[PDB]
From a paper:
Altogether CD38 appears to be a key player in the biosynthesis of calcium messengers which are involved in a wide range of cellular functions. Thus, the catalytic transformation of NAD+ involves the formation, via a ribooxocarbenium ion-like transition state, of a unique reaction intermediate that partitions between several competing pathways such as an irreversible hydrolytic process leading to ADP-ribose and a reversible minor pathway that governs the formation of cADPR. The L-shaped structure of bCD38 consists of two distinct domains separated by a cleft and connected by a hinge region. α-Helices are found mainly in the N-terminal and membrane-proximal domain of this transmembrane protein, whereas β-sheets are preponderant in the distal C-terminal domain. The active site of bCD38 consists in a funnel-shaped cavity with a fairly rigid structure; it buries the NMN+ moiety of the substrate and its scissile bond in its deepest non-polar and least solvent accessible region, whereas the AMP moiety interacts with its more solvent-exposed region, at the entrance of the catalytic cleft.
Next we replaced NAD+ with 2′-deoxy-2′-β-D-fluororibofuranoside NAD+ (rFNAD), a close (bioisosteric) structural analog carrying a fluorine atom at position 2′ of the ribose moiety linked to nicotinamide (N-ribose). Using this strategy, we were able to trap a non-covalent complex between the E218Q mutant and rFNAD and its structure was solved at 1.94 Å. Despite the presence of two CD38 molecules in the asymmetric unit of E218Q mutant of bCD38, the structure of the non-covalent complex with rFNAD revealed that only one site is fully occupied; it is possible that one of the monomer and active site are rendered less accessible and/or reactive due to crystalline packing constraints. In particular the ribose from the adenosine part is well-resolved in density. This NAD+ analog is constrained by the enzyme in a somewhat folded conformation and is stabilized in the active site by extensive interactions. The electron density maps show that the nicotinamide ring of rFNAD is buried in the active site in agreement with the experimental observation that the cleavage of the nicotinamide-ribosyl bond is the first step of catalysis. Thus, the N7 atom of its carboxamide group is hydrogen bonded to Oε1 of the carboxylate group of Glu138 (d = 2.7 Å) and Asp147 (at a suboptimal distance = 3.3 Å). Upon formation of the Michaelis complex, this hydration network is disrupted and displaced by the binding of the N-ribose moiety of the ligand. As shown in Figure 4A in the rFNAD/E218Q complex the 2′-deoxy-2′-fluororibose linked to nicotinamide is fixed in the active site through efficient hydrogen bonds between its 3′-OH group, which displaces a bound water molecule, and the Oε1 atom of the mutant residue Gln218 (d = 2.7 Å) and backbone NH group of Trp118 (d = 2.9 Å).
Author numbering:
A (entry chain A): 40 to 277
B (entry chain B): 39 to 275
């Protein structure tokens, strides 16, 4: 197919419904009950048969309202450029990243796109964010989910950043661009800049990029505590 | 066209929306960054103009709510039902926030609006009454959409000001009842303040039908509940 991105995950619909069952029954049973058939149907309806490069935030409002990415106060974890580590940290400390919310869990690691005049997914290729269009259903999903995740944050939240990069805070990242500026006001944020096993840090809490982050948080009336110069192992020990 | 049961659209609706948006974003609650009030007003108009006033859906307000979500800091939220004036004077004095203190709630408070298919203008003549005409009207749908997100957004300790004075301080069919209470997140703690007129005595209290009503809803959602009754209008304020 013509897009520069990999095609939709095979059997997407089955995966998201089975993941929904597993999540609602065995991961976060609670609660209030949710219909996973309805959630799957809402997920498909958001993007199926639509122009794969005209995704808007508004296409996802209904899906999100069925299961907002809300995490109990003091359990929320943000991350940027630290995928593996942040999730290991969350899993071990019993915390929740975006990928641990119902909708994040459904979509984590999946790919999807549709095609006008078709009720099927495009399993051949999907729009690439850089080569094709930013406004694609995969990228917009994560942007909008990220935004609501940031909005619903409460009490103490933590963020895991990459101390082996020149700028641990990337203002063009999803964290920098969508999450930090939408963080609920008056929450408290603790940041951990963590470096490879490995090697001396390339960024710190005193670096320019973190000062940029503090400036955004000052604006959101968010108290900020930053810790750095820790290796992955040292971090996971504290 | 004057066929509906409800008062027509507020005259100057568009001007009023723009003025209030400027006031809110510049003088009341300046944000950490700017919101484009022209864009907000355009989105508000586009939601309903030239549409069947009885075919409103929540989706019609997606763009608008995305421009200005009615969310606020934990512990800040004041809910109300049948206690508008009291609740708002309460909120003001304690520097808390009702829905009407959010950007969109502030824009829309006390206004009416509806359109008519094939017309680019508001219907100044009449608009659908939510009882006598249709529930799916742009005025009722707006408040339900806003109310739901505001309730969703609540965290830590939040409060609701009830009246009674009424045989049922908690009306299960009010917006608070259908839409707010049932959308509070688990572990949120709701304080209910049953305030009678003062005024001769009450009519309802933290014991009654109406509450086993509310409390029941909170239970089963995992919302903690504190009910303070036997309070007057002067005590409370
Ligand atoms: N500012 C407002 O006009 C407003 C309207 C509706 C709802 N709210 C939000 O919900 C709560 C109050 O609504 P309520 O229905 O619990 O309280 P009432 O005093 O019973 O009603 C307030 C106004 O809403 C109207 N109302 C109630 N149900 C509907 C409906 N289904 N459709 C249109 N209007 C309705 C009602 O007639 C009254 O003028 C309050 O916490 C606030 F957050 C605000
Ligand atoms: C900080 O960022 C770097 C760059 O992304 C990460 O290193 C990559 O990690 C992946 C996943 O293990 C490897 O497959 C790549 O080979 C690595 N790329 C490079 C350029 O080294 C690193 O894991 C991050 N560090 C922390 C502490 O999260
Ligand atoms: C409880 O409900 C009653 C009835 O709505 C409220 O009384 C009204 O208040 C307004 C504003 O002062 C008056 O103009 C109306 O005449 C009143 N209506 C009736 C039927 O009395 C009363 O304000 C509410 N009490 C509290 C504590 O909010």
């Amino acid at each position: 197919n013509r897009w520069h991105g990999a095609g939709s995950t095979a059997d997407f619909q089955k995966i998201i419904q089975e993941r929904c069952d597993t999540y609602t029954q065995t991961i976060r049973p609670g609660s209030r009950s949710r219909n996973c058939q309805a959630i799957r149907q809402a997920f498909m309806s958001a993007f199926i048969s639509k122009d794969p490069c005209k995704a808007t935030k508004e296409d996802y409002n209904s899906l999100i309202n069925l299961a907002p990415p809300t995490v109990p106060c003091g359990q929320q974890v943000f991350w940027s450029k630290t995928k593996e580590l942040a999730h290991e940290y969350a899993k071990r400390r019993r915390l929740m990243t975006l990928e641990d919310t119902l909708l994040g869990y459904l979509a984590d690691g999946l790919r999807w796109c549709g095609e006008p005049g078709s009720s099927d997914l495009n399993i051949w290729s999907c729009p690439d964010w850089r080569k094709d269009c930013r406004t694609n259903y995969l990228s917009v999903f994560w942007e909008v989910l990220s935004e609501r995740f940031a909005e619903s944050a409460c009490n103490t939240v933590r963020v895991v950043l990459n101390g082996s990069l020149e700028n641990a805070f990337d203002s063009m990242s999803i964290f920098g661009r969508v999450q930090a500026p939408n963080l609920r006001p008056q929450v408290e944020l603790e940041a951990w800049l963590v470096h490879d096993t490995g090697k001396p840090p390339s960024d710190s809490c005193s670096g320019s990029s973190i000062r940029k982050l503090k400036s955004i948080l000052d604006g959101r009336n968010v108290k900020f505590r930053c810790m750095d110069n820790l290796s992955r192992d040292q971090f996971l020990q504290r």
